[PDB]
Amino acid sequence: PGKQISNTIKQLSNLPEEELPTYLNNIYEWRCAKTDLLYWVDVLDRFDEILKAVVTEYGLGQFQNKPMKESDKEMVYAILKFQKLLVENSSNKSMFSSFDVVEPFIYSFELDLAIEALYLVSFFASKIHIQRSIKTSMALMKMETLKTLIERVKEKPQSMYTYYDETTNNCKRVSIKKAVKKGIYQEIRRFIHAIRLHEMAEQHEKLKIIRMLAFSALVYYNYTDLPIDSEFISRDLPETLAIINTESYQMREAAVTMIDAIFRMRIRHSAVIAAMNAQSHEGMIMNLLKKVVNEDVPEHFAIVFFNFLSSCFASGPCVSALFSAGIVQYVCNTLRDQPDISYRKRMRLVMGANTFLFTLPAPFTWFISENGIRILSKELLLAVDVALGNIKDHDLLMYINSIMKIISQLFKNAGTAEAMRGFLEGEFPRAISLILFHSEEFTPSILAYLFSAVGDYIHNEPSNLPFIIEAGIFDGFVMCMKKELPESPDFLLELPNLIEAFFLNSELIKKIDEENILDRIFESFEIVNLSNIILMYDIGRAYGIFLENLVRHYPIISLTVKEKIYNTMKNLESMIPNTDPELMRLLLGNLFRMMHRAVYRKTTNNQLITDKGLLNNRIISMLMLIEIPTETELYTDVMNILMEVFDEDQTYVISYIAKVIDRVMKNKVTLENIEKIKRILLIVNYLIFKNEETCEEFIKHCTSKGFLQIVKRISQYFDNLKKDTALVSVAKNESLTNLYYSFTMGILKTVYRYSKTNAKEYLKIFGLLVEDLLSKTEQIDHLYYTQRMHGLKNYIMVDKSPQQYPQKNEFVVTQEYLMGINLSETLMEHAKNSVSMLKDEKITMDAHKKVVSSILEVLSIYVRGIKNLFVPVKEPKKKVCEIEEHVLIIVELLMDYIDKSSIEHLLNIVKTAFFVTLRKQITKEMDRENEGSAEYKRRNILGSFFISVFLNLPKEETEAVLKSDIFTILVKNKKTFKQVYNKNCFGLLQYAAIKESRVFSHLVSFIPKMTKQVGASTDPAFLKLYAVGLVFVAMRDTLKKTTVLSRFIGNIVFAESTCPAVVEAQGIVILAIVKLKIEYNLAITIEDPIIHLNRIYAIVETAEQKEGLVILANLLIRRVIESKEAAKEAVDTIIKNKHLGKSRMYTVHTVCSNLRNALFYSISSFLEYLSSNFECISAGWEEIRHKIKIYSGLNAELFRTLFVHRATGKMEQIVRIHSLCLLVVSFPQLISTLVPEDYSFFMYFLENHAAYSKSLKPSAFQQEDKTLAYWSGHFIMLIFNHTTYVEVKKYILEKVLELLPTSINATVIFSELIQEILTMRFSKNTFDENTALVKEMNCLEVMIRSTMQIDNRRKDYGSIMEILTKPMEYITRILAVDEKEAFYEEVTQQSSSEQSEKNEFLKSLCILPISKLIGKEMEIFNADERMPFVQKILEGSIISN
């Protein structure tokens, strides 16, 4: 911002609309630096909205108010002109959203509005070729609307106007000469424009310049993807240059802007130069230059024209042509010949120069050869000698700025080193000395470019340096620096460069040391006003690099630089506590980011300027004063430099921080001191954590008595902080205790993880800290026990075995460390005392649960690595048996207080008590003999207690651990078997039953007792248990037992239910019973399942997750249909699927897992297949040598009976037809035996299929309607594809042909029916007979008859035609082609939640192959079991066979 910026913003925002033009007219030109548009957002919005109000008052559609007020027009005219004036010197113009209002001003009746708005448009879209981002801003209006102004305006050019319109497609006139009423005299706007051009001819020159402005604006939006031919440049460019050369100024303004637009896009610059006459010395732009220097031109047009020239000077060939014309000699002649030209003319000349003296090197070479530099010296000296003794002339100082810059970039460019020859010889030294001696009254840019050029020339050669020196140049420099320095960025940016350039000589170094100019260089940081500039630019990095290179090349002043810089850090640290916090935050950020690169580098002489002790003193003094956020860059830099210093020498750093923290500790207790200790604890935590490798001395000092006494005093002070809550709140006390404990944890982890840590020395400090902790525990206030006990848990955590070996959970050496402390006695004391308070009822029950869970986990993970725990081992059972006795005592003491937070730890305890057994570390014989053991009976009675405790909870909590391997042995006892069977928690029963065999040994005996309770049990768990038990006993009896299955006789009847779980249970029971009956002789007889089937279909409507219901229904129905031979052949095909792969498959287990469905389907079939056609399975003994459907026993009558079911509801009919599709796909042979009369029922299928049109989508539809239509059509087309049945196909093709021409939708859907009939090809020969049958009936005749008969004049008629193009074309292509290639041809040659989930479920439904159907249906029976005893015993049977 600034002073004028905000003042103009507020004036344009507050001044009334009547007074707005009055103040606007004062500011004729922007005499200020380039700004940004983001500050005038409010001004832009106000001007835009008042423009909307004005134009809406005018109508924006008809311009009804032709006689308009002068106040509003003057207001808008000034608003536009000065908005433009503000905006040419602005930034970020892609956000300009006021563009949409200017279009009606172009067509407005007052053409001052139009000229101003089009001037704004010209400026805004003149930058398209450079920025290219104004596409969004200027896309508010079309680029095609204003094309009515291609025609040239003459003296009343046209009294005839022709307009072109649609539909009529004719051109005619509308009278304009009437002009009776102002209302009627892109199309009414075009009519208004016609009236403007014809009726009002007095202001015909004005509308003429309007038309040029509008055509130019169209060019500016887009110069159009352009018809660029040779003739385009041949007429457009010469006509425009003649326009500029001959006619007036307003229109040549648009002309020069548009030719600049044409130039900048950089196309056809060869023809542009050729027609441009730019290579001639007197080209048209140089002709304009002569005109401008001779006769005055308006400032706006002059600025635009010279910006056009500057754009021209950017391109290569263009500047080459201009230089060949002699632009350098031209401007040199104009400069030499007359001194009376204005400063602005030479300003424009040198702004051109700052481009064409750097675009190409040849103009620079000729300029050097043309004595140009000395001419510049002459003009500069005369300008400055006129300057002296007079008031501030803005134009003169801007000219001097321009001279300084042009010389600065001329010297800086590497290829422009030709100017070094004539600097000293010319009056450049005198001019630069004069500039230095009067720098106070000059623009700071003058001085910055001066310093830049001086430094560059000094660096160019040291030959002429003294001639600079004793000429008083350095004297003038020093006396200039003595006065208060300018507050400019570039001045202090370029000062170090000249300092180094002077340092190129030793005498200058000794003199600057004598005069100490570095004082100001260093002090440049601590200025509040300049601090903003320091924020903006990267001054700190520049200072750091400068000082680094200075000390690198010149270590002579290293001592002085060091002393002065440390004095500067001390001075800056002095003003920290007594200034606004953000000020030190940002100043310290700057100072640290500059010392980051200034000090601690790897170059030479940096070790001289890196002092560890003093820098540590200053950094610690900084640290104990200010709080620093983590995410700030200053935090990162201070951490980086401090860790580098610490890594340089850890010992002195830790010793010094220790003594400083002790000394500040012994002072008064203050909250600021609390912040200091907090931050010091945090920083020591980070430095401990970041330490990758540690020296042994650091570990020893951490174990030194001084360090531990410091830490114990810290603990004492923290306890003092715990004295009162008002000073340190409970949250603050908890936080400080947590951070202190975290420090202890970190140091303990570091010392333990240290290589070959001294066990005794580490245990010494560990014992000291734990005894301090337990001493602090006896205090009555136990509210902080949570973090203390978490701390002791972490103490257990740090002393743990590395467990590097995978699948290893056992203490390596930490067991002895743990047992050497007698922690068990402390556990006993804590347990009894906690139960004592439990009797005292002063603790919340949930708090009691969390306390006992904490105790349980402490004990569990304290003992889980104890060796030979519950192991009957002879020698080491002296104390581990005592530990087990303690554990049983404690668990007896806490028999009634096991919570969900404790059940996992109880599982951990039981896992530890049986670790080797469940990990199969037993030999099945050592376990078989270890029954008579003290540890064995102990763990038995404990397991009894755990079962008793677990059975005291509701089902919800027990569901978490319903599947644990511990129960496999817990229920293995028949006593516990029946005890938990009485508890009715059968999920454990199924899981352990799958995982264990003796549980089945008892369960099969149990089954006959509960065979009677099955009837209408209405329980999921009981029924699934019955099913799984029956199937498992059936397979076990097939495994050469047999006689057990024969003894089971009974019968069960079922009732009706509405709850789903009951119906899935009944369905699974039917599955099991029918599958067992069809395969094996079982005396249990059940009724006809079809009643339960229609139950399922009647109920699937309301139930959720119908996927299970439908899949079980389909599987059971094919079980009913299928026979043993069909299943055996299907299993054979499944085996052959892998058999043809001939992979390696060395292990039996992987093959069994991949084919679990084949194994568990019918074990007899797979066993006989492996006996005869054995696969390529190594079988654990070398390698083995390796190597149309007709089915019987089917139930076709049931299919026929369900065929005429004719249900009513939507979803169950959809399910039934899906089942029909699946069964016919699986079993096409059943359709062959249907009654020859049922074909009349296909009417329903084809009708409800054709009722809905998927192509012509009707609204108010349901997704279920789409599903029904798709599936109904799919069923019949599947009959076509998958069946070789001719007569039924002939009958149905008849029916479809008669029903086709009934209606338009019927015709479309029937043509699509035939299309999908012919598209996907089931088989080659079958497709051939299909084609023969379809051609025999000659469908084409009648269907094309329907094609042209229904032709009617209607809106959707045409759309129906392109819909129907594809079917006949495809049929004709197929039919005409012979049988051989016809098969080879192709085409084109929470209510919402339930609805969404059921729709997605319907979408998921599709046809699947039988094998994965088996897999997913019997996943329920296997319960996704991986390695049961079933697979092991089957592998044994296979191996033995």
CA distances, 185 to each of 146, 175, 597 (Å): 21, 7, 78
Give the Cβ contact number of residue 713 at 10 Å.
14
Give the Cβ contact number of residue 1195 at 10 Å.
14
Look at strands 171-172 and 163-164 and give their pairing. antiparallel
Centroid of chain to Cα 138 = 32
Contact present, 143 and 221 (Cβ < 8 Å): yes
Q: Give me the amino acid identity at 197.
A: L
Q: Give me the amino acid identity at 1085.
A: T
Contact present, 188 and 61 (Cβ < 8 Å): yes
Contact present, 1146 and 1178 (Cβ < 8 Å): yes
Which DSSP state fits 150? -
CA distance 326 to 281: 6
Q: Please, what is the angle between helix 671-690 and helix 650-665, to 10°?
A: 160
Give the Cβ contact number of residue 54 at 10 Å.
22
For 72, the token pair is 């509003």
CA distances, 387 to each of 32, 402, 483 (Å): 21, 15, 21
The HSE-up count of residue 390 (CA atoms within 13 Å, CB side) is: 11
CA distance 1435 to 694: 57
Centroid of chain to Cα 651 = 45
CA distance 624 to 933: 65
For 365, the token pair is 């070479």
Q: What contacts 152, CB < 8 A, 6 or more positions away?
A: none
Report which of 1064, 960, 1050, 975 is spatially closest to residue 1021, judged by C-alpha positions.
Answer: 1064
Which DSSP state fits 164? E
3-state SS class at 172: strand
Q: What contacts 212, CB < 8 A, 6 or more positions away?
A: 251, 254, 255
CA distance 962 to 778: 41
Which DSSP state fits 65? -
Q: What is the DSSP string of 490-524?
A: HHHHHHHHHHHHHHTSHHHHHHHHHHTTHHHHHHG
Contact present, 458 and 465 (Cβ < 8 Å): yes
CA-CA-CA-CA dihedral for 187, 190, 195, 200, to nearest 10: 160
3-state SS class at 171: strand
CA distance 487 to 1289: 98
Task: Give the helix/strand (H/E) hosting 962.
Answer: none
Q: What is the DSSP string of 1339-1355?
A: HHHHHHHHHHHT----T
CA distance 679 to 623: 8
Report which of 66, 48, 50 is spatially closest to residue 58, judged by C-alpha positions.
Answer: 66
Q: How many residues does the chain have?
A: 1441
Contact present, 1062 and 1020 (Cβ < 8 Å): yes
Contact present, 1242 and 1194 (Cβ < 8 Å): no
Centroid of chain to Cα 667 = 52
Dihedral of alpha carbons 332, 333, 338, 340, sign? negative
Backbone phi, psi, residue 171, to 5°: -120, 135
Q: Give me the amino acid identity at 1253.
A: S
**C-alpha angle with apex 1239: 1235 to 1244, nearest 5 degrees?**
135
Dihedral of alpha carbons 225, 227, 233, 239, sign? negative
Q: Exposed, middle or buried: residue 717 (CB in 10 Å: 0-12, 13-18, 19+)?
A: middle
Dihedral of alpha carbons 683, 686, 691, 696, sign? positive
Contact present, 591 and 524 (Cβ < 8 Å): no
Contact present, 357 and 320 (Cβ < 8 Å): no
Q: What contacts 1021, CB < 8 A, 6 or more positions away?
A: 986, 987, 990
CA distance 862 to 830: 15
CA distance 95 to 376: 42
CA distance 223 to 263: 11
Report which of 546, 560, 637 is spatially closest to residue 598, judged by C-alpha positions.
Answer: 546
CA distances, 454 to each of 263, 390, 408, 414, 460 (Å): 38, 27, 9, 16, 10
CA distances, 855 to each of 830, 851, 852, 860, 886 (Å): 9, 6, 5, 9, 13
Radius of gyration of the chain (CA): 49
CA distances, 762 to each of 704, 752, 772, 812, 826 (Å): 11, 7, 16, 17, 21
CA distance 723 to 443: 66
Give the Cβ contact number of residue 1403 at 10 Å.
10
Q: What is the DSSP string of 400-442?
A: HHHHHHHHHHHHHSGGGGGGGTTTTTTTHHHHHHHHHHTGGGS
Backbone phi, psi, residue 172, to 5°: -155, 170
Dihedral-angle region of residue 1321 (phi above 0 means left; psi in -120 to 50 means alpha; beta otherwise): beta
Contact present, 826 and 816 (Cβ < 8 Å): no
CA distances, 408 to each of 268, 414, 1128 (Å): 34, 12, 96
CA-CA-CA-CA dihedral for 783, 785, 791, 792, to nearest 10: 170
Q: Given the structure tokens 């004539």, which residue do they identify?
A: 422
3-state SS class at 891: helix
Give the Cβ contact number of residue 1139 at 10 Å.
16
3-state SS class at 100: helix
Q: What is the DSSP string of 520-541?
A: HHHHGGG-HHHHHHHHHS-HHH
Q: What contacts 165, CB < 8 A, 6 or more positions away?
A: 187
For 820, the token pair is 């050497």
CA distance 353 to 402: 10
CA distance 482 to 485: 8
Q: Exposed, middle or buried: residue 846 (CB in 10 Å: 0-12, 13-18, 19+)?
A: exposed
CA distance 31 to 124: 20
The HSE-up count of residue 130 (CA atoms within 13 Å, CB side) is: 12
CA distance 473 to 465: 10
Resolved by: cryo-EM
The HSE-up count of residue 913 (CA atoms within 13 Å, CB side) is: 29
Report which of 1350, 1244, 1334, 1253 is spatially closest to residue 1297, judged by C-alpha positions.
Answer: 1334
Q: What contacts 595, CB < 8 A, 6 or more positions away?
A: 544, 641
Angstrom resolution of this structure: 6.4
For 184, the token pair is 């009627």
Task: Provide the strand spans (E) within 56-111.
Answer: none
CA distances, 67 to each of 63, 71, 188, 833 (Å): 10, 12, 19, 102
For 871, the token pair is 């192991």
Contact present, 728 and 674 (Cβ < 8 Å): yes
CA distance 1190 to 873: 67
Report which of 773, 776, 774 is spatially closest to residue 722, judged by C-alpha positions.
Answer: 776
CA distance 188 to 174: 12
Dihedral-angle region of residue 1182 (phi above 0 means left; psi in -120 to 50 means alpha; beta otherwise): left
Q: Given the structure tokens 């009515």, which residue do they identify?
A: 148
Q: Given the structure tokens 């129906």, which residue do they identify?
A: 1360
Report which of 1061, 1058, 1081, 1079 is spatially closest to residue 1069, judged by C-alpha positions.
Answer: 1061
CA distances, 41 to each of 37, 48, 721, 1090 (Å): 7, 10, 55, 78
3-state SS class at 251: helix
CA distance 251 to 1173: 98
CA distance 609 to 247: 72
The HSE-up count of residue 510 (CA atoms within 13 Å, CB side) is: 3
Which DSSP state fits 146? G
Which DSSP state fits 469? I
For 653, the token pair is 């750093």
Q: Given the structure tokens 């049986």, which residue do they identify?
A: 914
Dihedral of alpha carbons 837, 838, 841, 844, sign? positive
For 525, the token pair is 């940081």
Contact present, 905 and 856 (Cβ < 8 Å): yes
For 1366, the token pair is 């594809």
Q: What is the DSSP string of 1163-1196?
A: HHHHHHHHHHS--S--TTSS----------S--H
Report which of 805, 803, 808 is spatially closest to residue 919, judged by C-alpha positions.
Answer: 808
Task: Give the helix/strand (H/E) hosting 443.
Answer: none
The HSE-up count of residue 613 (CA atoms within 13 Å, CB side) is: 2
Instruction: List beta partners, residue 164.
Output: 171
HEC profile for 771-822? Answer: HHHHHHHCCCCCCCHHHHHHHHHHHHHHCCCCCCCCCCCCCCCHHHHHHCCC
For 493, the token pair is 């940016």
Which DSSP state fits 163? E
Give the Cβ contact number of residue 522 at 10 Å.
17
CA distance 33 to 26: 18
Q: What contacts 378, CB < 8 A, 6 or more positions away?
A: 427
Centroid of chain to Cα 411 = 48
**C-alpha angle with apex 846: 840 to 850, nearest 5 degrees?**
95
**C-alpha angle with apex 698: 696 to 704, nearest 5 degrees?**
105
Task: Give the helix/strand (H/E) hosting 1079.
Answer: helix 1060-1079
